Amino acid sequence: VGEKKYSVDEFTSRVAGLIAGTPLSQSVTYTKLSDVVDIPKMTKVDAESRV
Amino acid sequence: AIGLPSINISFKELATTVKERSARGIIAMVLKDAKALGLNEIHEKEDIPV
Amino acid sequence: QKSYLKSKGVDLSYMTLQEIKEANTGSKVFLKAKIKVLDAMEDIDLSIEI
Amino acid sequence: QKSYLKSKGVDLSYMTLQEIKEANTGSKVFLKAKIKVLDAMEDIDLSIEI
Structure with a gap:
């Protein structure tokens, strides 16, 4: 967020x-x-598993 | 189990259907020769083996 | 309330429903309620036939 | 919607279609829509008699 x-x-x-x-x-x-500009690349199936 | 929110749009054709009944009007012609032995499936009048 | 009255040894065999509800409880109040809680639209399934 | 409600285990025997329709779904929406798609003229058949 904001280069930090x-x-x-x-x-x-x-x-x-x-x-x-x-x-x-x-x-x-x-x-x-x-505010947020970037997130580490993470796949959809991993997101479903985490949820 | 709770997953990611789902938004889905589906398109389908209304398959207006008339039931298929047993085919009628076909002929089985059986003959003897030494050329092109076996069936030939002459569905078309002008399709003739030479 | 019925369980509480049985716990104190009162004879409630002949006392009927409303009479059991009338019985003194001594500073104790027993209450039950039912509700249904709404939620936000989250998953939409739309089916379209052409 | 009826399939979803029955899958949850509700008793829908006596409740009517109108009553079934308001029934809570919990963040799920089910809709169906019918449309007809036009097309451009491609084949024209004209018959003229003298």
């Missing part, structure tokens, strides 16, 4: 803020993150 590397524990604050911001009627699923 973040650990997962580092981004815990951001994800917690994201869950706190959303209202009750809506869900968190499929929400844009314009």
Whole structure:
């Protein structure tokens, strides 16, 4: 995010803020993150397994 | 098991079907020769072996 | 409430439904409720025939 | 929707089609739509008698 590397524990604050911001009627699923620019390449089947 | 969200669109043709019944009007012609032994499957009038 | 009344040894063989509900409980309240919780649209399956 | 509800184990015997239709699905939506696709003229058959 912004030419800075973040650990997962580092981004815990951001994800917690994201869950706190959303209202009750809506869900968190499929929400844009314009701040983030890059993620390590990871396949779809691995994502399904992790989920 | 919960997986990734699924959005799927499917297109299909309405297969209007009339049942296929046993074929009628075919002839089995059996003959003797020394050329092109076996069946020849003359489905067309002008398709004739030489 | 029926279990609690049996626990104190009261004779409830003849007391009927509403009468059992009327019985004094002594600062104890027993309540049950049912609800259905909505959720967001997550998986959409659309089938189109041409 | 009926197949999904029965797969979960609901008793849908007495509830009607209208009643079955509102039944909660839990983040799943099922829809079907019918369309007819036009095409451009490609073969023209004209018959003229004198």
